[PDB]
Amino acid sequence: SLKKGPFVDGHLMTKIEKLNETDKKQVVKTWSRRSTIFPQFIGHTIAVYDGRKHVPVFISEDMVGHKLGEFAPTRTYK
Amino acid sequence: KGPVAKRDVLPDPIYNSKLVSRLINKMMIDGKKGKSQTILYKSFDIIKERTGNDAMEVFEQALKNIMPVLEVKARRVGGANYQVPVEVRPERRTTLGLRWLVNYARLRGEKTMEERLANEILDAANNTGAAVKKREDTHKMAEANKAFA
Amino acid sequence: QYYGTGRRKSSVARVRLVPGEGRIVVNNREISEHIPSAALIEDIKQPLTLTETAGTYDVLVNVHGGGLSGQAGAIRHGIARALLEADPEYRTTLKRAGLLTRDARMKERKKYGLKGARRAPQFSK
Amino acid sequence: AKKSMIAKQQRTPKFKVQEYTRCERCGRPHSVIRKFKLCRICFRELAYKGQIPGVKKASW
Amino acid sequence: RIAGVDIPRDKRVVISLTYIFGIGRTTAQQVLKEAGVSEDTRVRDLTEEELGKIRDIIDKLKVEGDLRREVSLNIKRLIEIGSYRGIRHRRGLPVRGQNSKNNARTRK
Amino acid sequence: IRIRLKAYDHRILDQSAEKIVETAKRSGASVSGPIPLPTEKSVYTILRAVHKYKDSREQFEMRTHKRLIDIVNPTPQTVDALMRLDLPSGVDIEI
RNA sequence: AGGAAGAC
RNA sequence: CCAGCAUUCAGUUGGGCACUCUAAGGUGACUGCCGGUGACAAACCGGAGGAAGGUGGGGAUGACGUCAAAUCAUCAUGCCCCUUAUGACCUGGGCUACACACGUGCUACAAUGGACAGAACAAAGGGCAGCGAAACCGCGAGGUUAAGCCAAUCCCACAAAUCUGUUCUCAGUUCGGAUCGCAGUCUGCAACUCGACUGCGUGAAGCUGGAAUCGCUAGUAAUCGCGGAUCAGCAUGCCGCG
């Protein structure tokens, strides 16, 4: 994803789009750290696999260019 | 073991001025030669008509005034690490004289290379020199501790 | 049209000297902007002056390979071969004067486990 | 467990970047030579045996 | 002087303009090439009209405090986003990813 | 027509060189001498040990070399004769 | 005939 | 290879191997001669055609054994658990964390320099699910259609240190380049955890380093580059070359 746009997991892309076009629903279960946050995903709740659990995160408006991955750091220090 | 030396000749045996031939074509190598030697030649010219005589004999007495006659080594005897003065072979004399010349010329620190090299050449030309004073330091240690033989 | 070969430090040169008026030229470019590093100037001026054959022969020099000082040594060996080819009557005088050594000083083969084929890396207890 | 990953080696993988190199005469990754597909151990043993006719002791 | 802060006096302009914040050597070269000052100029000798037009072109470029407040705004935006990299700036650890055990000594 | 041959064993390639020169000369094919072409080199470095002692290594040389011959005149019957002529299994002929 | 220097 | 020739900015070409060059057979250096020592022996020193005189330089070559040294990570009787699982499939993470201490290296602290401009000298390897020239676009890594090469032809291959001009004039500086934000290029399904590279801006510590300590004898140290290997991509690591 450097010149031709964000590269994502299209199955749950269309799943969350068919979610939000109808209603607001519960957290989105995902193992995938792969995805970039598209700008139309504002206000959703994502459960990201941290390696041991699925942490909940709310999506704010400021999710400009960075991917989904930084919401769940995989290391605990002190 | 045993020492051994080799033979090699750079210059011509006849019709060869030693210091002039050395000055034009000998023993400074590995780059930064050309501009440094031209500005070094005109440093020789500015000290040539800075002194009131020929400058080669004051360069050679500068070499004498940097040129050491004795130095002292350290030998292990007793519990004091005593010092023994020694008479010196002429190639070692030449190596020491040029070595102190170049390293104190690069070591004192000045504006740039040609004027500093001329600065310690003139500083060796007069007797009140820094590395000259180090040569007399080597003597005053040597004839301070030459009661050891 | 006497022809000589010279090799020094991974470089070769060939020399052709014929009777001229004493002209000296390498690669058909001249002394000023073709020849830096005045060790090359004493190279090109030493043997013709020590011999009495200076102003008689003109020399064209062709060059292949190598660097500057090794190239100068190749010039040395080429012109030494050219003179021993041309005028052998004082070739023995040139022999015990020297300059016919053709030194075998070439780059050392790098040894495995060493840095520069002499330098072990570093040591500690 | 080695022949599980040997089965990964002969089987085509899911994506083409996931494919890697194994020498497959002896059983290891990690310093396979590409143009022989032999690693150091089984290469030098079978080279002292004398196959791969280009190869001999090296000195210059 | 130019951006409200002083200038060195006895050096060339293509170097002296690099002293003020947020502008640099290559940028100063490319602005003074079209400015036409021949890249060797003391500030003791210049004209007021060329001073005014370099004043407005460095006025249009992002020089004085705006780069500072811009990078501050992005980094505080990263703090209330959180998202790991802001935690790295808050802790002082290196960010672009390195061996954090061996050197890590420009920071902290 | 130019014929190349490239292999490891310069002995048997040399007797192949005079054997092809002998066949072409007895056919009268406007013969040219075999020109020695420069070799190509590949030196590989192997860990001497199995698990340890990285400073212990060994080197293995691979050297392969080529030679070229040229026939000026066409002479197609003798050219087909030297096509149908048998060759050893190391001479590695290329047309 | 030319230094004091412990333990595993 | 362009010597000896005619030809053109591409000296490509028409013609030819004497040279470097690639390489088979060799020629060659072996104590082969003189003197002096050495009981006249073996050897040592100084001399001569010589490219090298006393194993010419280097590599490969590593005896009986020692350290119960290292490896059950290629293979293999010896026991242990399983075979409705310490054996299996995949997704994500970790091997790259970080108050610290150490080993090995790189880049410097500079005017025996930095920056910019011009003239340079060209070793050894790799190339067809490739090497990729010219030209165009691009403030850049790169993109475009793409001539040539299964290679002493084509590409990597534009070698830097080197040599002449201007500047800086001794400063945390025009040194030094690390961290940081913005915007990108390439590879790959995917560069956050965790790739490389570029344009910017930011500019840090550092002004040659105590106790101690390391390498180095006929291109050796030191510097300057250049390739190559694993590999889609990633060098300061390693191997090799000048």
GROMACS .gro file of C-alpha atoms (C1' of nucleotides) in nm, chain H:
model
  242
  624C      C1'    1   4.561  -0.662  -3.052
  625C      C1'    2   4.539  -0.179  -3.460
  626A      C1'    3   5.235  -0.260  -3.441
  627G      C1'    4   5.327  -0.235  -3.954
  628C      C1'    5   4.867   0.030  -4.374
  629A      C1'    6   4.419   0.264  -4.620
  630U      C1'    7   3.989   0.450  -4.396
  631U      C1'    8   3.526   0.746  -4.035
  632C      C1'    9   3.268   1.167  -3.438
  633A      C1'   10   3.148   0.514  -3.255
  634G      C1'   11   4.029   0.353  -3.425
  635U      C1'   12   3.328   0.037  -3.559
  636U      C1'   13   3.562  -0.142  -4.079
  637G      C1'   14   3.918  -0.372  -4.564
  638G      C1'   15   4.356  -0.640  -4.405
  639G      C1'   16   4.767  -0.916  -4.025
  640C      C1'   17   4.968  -1.201  -3.544
  641A      C1'   18   5.500  -0.980  -3.369
  642C      C1'   19   5.380  -0.821  -2.891
  643U      C1'   20   4.962  -0.775  -2.341
  644C      C1'   21   4.584  -1.153  -2.369
  645U      C1'   22   4.381  -1.640  -2.307
  646A      C1'   23   4.733  -2.200  -2.267
  647A      C1'   24   4.935  -2.686  -2.378
  648G      C1'   25   5.444  -2.875  -2.424
  649G      C1'   26   5.837  -2.676  -2.200
  650U      C1'   27   6.263  -2.378  -2.136
  651G      C1'   28   6.401  -2.223  -1.599
  652A      C1'   29   6.697  -2.199  -0.999
  653C      C1'   30   6.866  -2.720  -0.853
  654U      C1'   31   7.406  -2.569  -0.385
  655G      C1'   32   7.455  -2.511  -1.055
  656C      C1'   33   8.113  -2.222  -1.049
  657C      C1'   34   8.525  -1.895  -0.758
  658G      C1'   35   8.735  -1.762  -0.279
  659G      C1'   36   8.746  -1.825   0.259
  660U      C1'   37   8.594  -2.121   0.688
  661G      C1'   38   8.454  -2.586   0.823
  662A      C1'   39   9.023  -3.211   0.937
  663C      C1'   40   8.884  -3.258   0.320
  664A      C1'   41   8.227  -3.438   0.511
  665A      C1'   42   7.750  -3.189   0.569
  666A      C1'   43   7.686  -2.699   0.590
  667C      C1'   44   7.789  -2.104   0.646
  668C      C1'   45   7.954  -1.604   0.419
  669G      C1'   46   8.084  -1.299  -0.007
  670G      C1'   47   8.065  -1.305  -0.563
  671A      C1'   48   7.835  -1.416  -1.174
  672G      C1'   49   7.509  -1.471  -1.673
  673G      C1'   50   6.985  -1.400  -1.411
  674A      C1'   51   6.302  -1.295  -1.319
  675A      C1'   52   6.423  -1.442  -0.860
  676G      C1'   53   7.027  -1.778  -0.442
  677G      C1'   54   7.020  -2.026  -0.097
  678U      C1'   55   6.260  -2.398   0.071
  679G      C1'   56   6.127  -1.677  -0.514
  680G      C1'   57   5.582  -1.512  -0.274
  681G      C1'   58   5.120  -1.739  -0.118
  682G      C1'   59   4.760  -2.143  -0.078
  683A      C1'   60   4.609  -2.660  -0.015
  684U      C1'   61   4.850  -3.004   0.302
  685G      C1'   62   4.739  -3.025   1.019
  686A      C1'   63   5.160  -3.708   1.294
  687C      C1'   64   5.082  -4.025   1.787
  688G      C1'   65   4.774  -3.790   2.124
  689U      C1'   66   4.548  -3.417   2.510
  690C      C1'   67   4.095  -3.121   2.655
  691A      C1'   68   3.498  -3.754   2.896
  692A      C1'   69   3.657  -3.010   2.439
  693A      C1'   70   3.163  -2.899   2.053
  694U      C1'   71   2.739  -3.123   1.782
  695C      C1'   72   2.172  -3.694   1.931
  696A      C1'   73   1.981  -3.017   1.486
  697U      C1'   74   2.184  -3.579   0.865
  698C      C1'   75   2.149  -4.094   0.998
  699A      C1'   76   2.121  -4.521   1.428
  700U      C1'   77   1.971  -5.079   1.850
  701G      C1'   78   1.951  -4.791   2.457
  702C      C1'   79   1.478  -4.618   2.798
  703C      C1'   80   1.083  -4.250   2.863
  704C      C1'   81   0.490  -4.006   2.671
  705C      C1'   82   0.167  -4.050   2.262
  706U      C1'   83  -0.073  -4.285   1.863
  707U      C1'   84  -0.921  -4.033   2.073
  708A      C1'   85  -0.109  -3.688   2.127
  709U      C1'   86   0.526  -3.377   2.375
  710G      C1'   87   0.277  -3.648   1.740
  711A      C1'   88  -0.065  -3.318   1.365
  712C      C1'   89  -0.367  -2.826   1.036
  713C      C1'   90  -0.380  -2.322   0.990
  714U      C1'   91  -0.462  -1.742   1.194
  715G      C1'   92  -0.221  -1.386   1.491
  716G      C1'   93   0.194  -1.293   1.808
  717G      C1'   94   0.749  -1.384   1.968
  718C      C1'   95   1.248  -1.495   1.811
  719U      C1'   96   1.378  -0.768   1.669
  720A      C1'   97   1.128  -0.649   2.418
  721C      C1'   98   1.494  -0.311   2.799
  722A      C1'   99   1.653  -0.015   3.400
  723C      C1'  100   2.154  -0.235   3.243
  724A      C1'  101   2.706  -0.464   3.183
  725C      C1'  102   3.023  -0.683   2.798
  726G      C1'  103   3.237  -0.897   2.293
  727U      C1'  104   3.308  -0.749   1.751
  728G      C1'  105   3.257  -0.377   1.393
  729C      C1'  106   3.085   0.104   1.130
  730U      C1'  107   3.063   0.643   1.134
  731A      C1'  108   3.314   1.060   1.320
  732C      C1'  109   3.535   1.457   1.649
  733A      C1'  110   3.809   1.771   1.098
  734A      C1'  111   4.154   2.247   0.737
  735U      C1'  112   4.737   1.607   0.579
  736G      C1'  113   3.994   1.871   0.548
  737G      C1'  114   3.415   1.989   0.398
  738A      C1'  115   3.127   2.177  -0.021
  739C      C1'  116   3.098   2.274  -0.551
  740A      C1'  117   3.316   2.258  -1.080
  741G      C1'  118   3.641   2.018  -1.439
  742A      C1'  119   4.033   1.610  -1.620
  743A      C1'  120   4.124   1.128  -1.502
  744C      C1'  121   4.388   0.532  -1.432
  745A      C1'  122   3.956   0.085  -1.560
  746A      C1'  123   4.144  -0.594  -1.146
  747A      C1'  124   3.848  -1.027  -1.034
  748G      C1'  125   3.284  -1.237  -1.057
  749G      C1'  126   2.745  -1.245  -1.198
  750G      C1'  127   2.374  -1.284  -1.554
  751C      C1'  128   1.677  -1.641  -1.954
  752A      C1'  129   1.040  -1.720  -1.395
  753G      C1'  130   1.720  -1.327  -1.590
  754C      C1'  131   2.105  -0.942  -1.689
  755G      C1'  132   1.861  -0.532  -1.875
  756A      C1'  133   2.165  -0.063  -2.291
  757A      C1'  134   1.947   0.407  -2.562
  758A      C1'  135   1.562   0.757  -2.514
  759C      C1'  136   1.153   0.990  -2.241
  760C      C1'  137   0.913   1.133  -1.761
  761G      C1'  138   1.040   1.250  -1.258
  762C      C1'  139   1.290   1.872  -0.720
  763G      C1'  140   1.426   1.087  -0.613
  764A      C1'  141   1.456   0.606  -0.493
  765G      C1'  142   1.217   0.475  -0.957
  766G      C1'  143   0.839   0.415  -1.415
  767U      C1'  144   0.766   0.363  -1.982
  768U      C1'  145   0.801   0.090  -2.444
  769A      C1'  146   1.198  -0.165  -2.444
  770A      C1'  147   1.785  -0.279  -2.901
  771G      C1'  148   2.168  -0.690  -2.726
  772C      C1'  149   2.318  -1.139  -2.459
  773C      C1'  150   2.250  -1.832  -2.336
  774A      C1'  151   2.810  -1.444  -2.281
  775A      C1'  152   3.680  -1.260  -2.423
  776U      C1'  153   3.075  -0.907  -2.815
  777C      C1'  154   2.527  -0.694  -2.454
  778C      C1'  155   2.443  -0.543  -1.917
  779C      C1'  156   2.603  -0.491  -1.399
  780A      C1'  157   3.075  -0.164  -1.573
  781C      C1'  158   2.910   0.576  -1.431
  782A      C1'  159   3.560   0.279  -0.959
  783A      C1'  160   3.670   0.603  -0.549
  784A      C1'  161   4.096   0.766  -0.285
  785U      C1'  162   4.392   1.078  -0.739
  786C      C1'  163   4.521   1.567  -1.017
  787U      C1'  164   4.379   2.152  -1.120
  788G      C1'  165   4.023   2.620  -0.954
  789U      C1'  166   3.671   2.922  -0.561
  790U      C1'  167   3.493   2.923  -0.063
  791C      C1'  168   3.507   2.834   0.468
  792U      C1'  169   3.985   3.050   0.873
  793C      C1'  170   3.939   2.704   1.382
  794A      C1'  171   3.393   2.753   1.549
  795G      C1'  172   2.990   2.226   1.821
  796U      C1'  173   3.145   2.531   1.256
  797U      C1'  174   2.968   2.491   0.558
  798C      C1'  175   3.236   1.926   1.105
  799G      C1'  176   2.952   1.511   1.233
  800G      C1'  177   2.534   1.255   1.098
  801A      C1'  178   2.194   0.984   1.489
  802U      C1'  179   1.713   1.035   1.652
  803C      C1'  180   1.202   1.280   1.508
  804G      C1'  181   0.747   1.492   1.165
  805C      C1'  182   0.577   1.538   0.638
  806A      C1'  183   0.568   1.337   0.134
  807G      C1'  184   0.725   0.939  -0.154
  808U      C1'  185   0.988   0.489  -0.477
  809C      C1'  186   1.056  -0.048  -0.504
  810U      C1'  187   0.962  -0.564  -0.355
  811G      C1'  188   0.592  -0.865  -0.179
  812C      C1'  189  -0.122  -1.131  -0.040
  813A      C1'  190   0.075  -0.794   0.352
  814A      C1'  191   0.622  -0.328   0.542
  815C      C1'  192   0.216  -0.129   1.286
  816U      C1'  193   0.445  -0.484   1.588
  817C      C1'  194   0.919  -0.592   1.207
  818G      C1'  195   1.225  -0.418   0.514
  819A      C1'  196   1.538  -0.119   0.221
  820C      C1'  197   1.599   0.342  -0.031
  821U      C1'  198   1.491   0.887  -0.158
  822G      C1'  199   1.342   1.431  -0.114
  823C      C1'  200   1.269   1.780   0.273
  824G      C1'  201   1.310   2.004   0.760
  825U      C1'  202   1.502   1.901   1.235
  826G      C1'  203   1.983   1.883   1.385
  827A      C1'  204   2.191   1.524   1.912
  828A      C1'  205   2.635   1.342   2.171
  829G      C1'  206   3.117   1.387   2.018
  830C      C1'  207   3.673   1.879   2.017
  831U      C1'  208   4.117   1.196   1.907
  832G      C1'  209   3.940   0.927   2.462
  833G      C1'  210   4.223   0.682   3.240
  834A      C1'  211   4.299   0.183   3.441
  835A      C1'  212   4.445  -0.157   3.093
  836U      C1'  213   4.434  -0.372   2.599
  837C      C1'  214   4.463  -0.558   2.006
  838G      C1'  215   4.678  -0.646   1.507
  839C      C1'  216   5.094  -0.578   1.198
  840U      C1'  217   5.747  -0.758   0.881
  841A      C1'  218   5.950  -0.752   0.002
  842G      C1'  219   5.232  -0.437  -0.140
  843U      C1'  220   5.278  -0.598   0.469
  844A      C1'  221   4.955  -0.202   0.810
  845A      C1'  222   4.647   0.189   0.688
  846U      C1'  223   4.297   0.402   0.370
  847C      C1'  224   3.993   0.405  -0.105
  848G      C1'  225   3.646   0.142  -0.363
  849C      C1'  226   3.477  -0.293  -0.647
  850G      C1'  227   3.223  -0.750  -0.698
  851G      C1'  228   3.009  -1.221  -0.510
  852A      C1'  229   2.732  -1.571  -0.191
  853U      C1'  230   2.163  -1.696   0.111
  854C      C1'  231   1.770  -1.424  -0.116
  855A      C1'  232   1.125  -1.129  -0.415
  856G      C1'  233   1.367  -0.702  -0.083
  857C      C1'  234   1.724  -0.592   0.329
  858A      C1'  235   2.486  -0.469   0.497
  859U      C1'  236   2.856  -0.188   0.891
  860G      C1'  237   2.835  -0.930   0.874
  861C      C1'  238   3.132  -1.305   0.573
  862C      C1'  239   3.421  -1.452   0.121
  863G      C1'  240   3.710  -1.270  -0.284
  864C      C1'  241   3.961  -0.864  -0.613
  865G      C1'  242   4.226  -0.419  -0.719
   0.00000   0.00000   0.00000
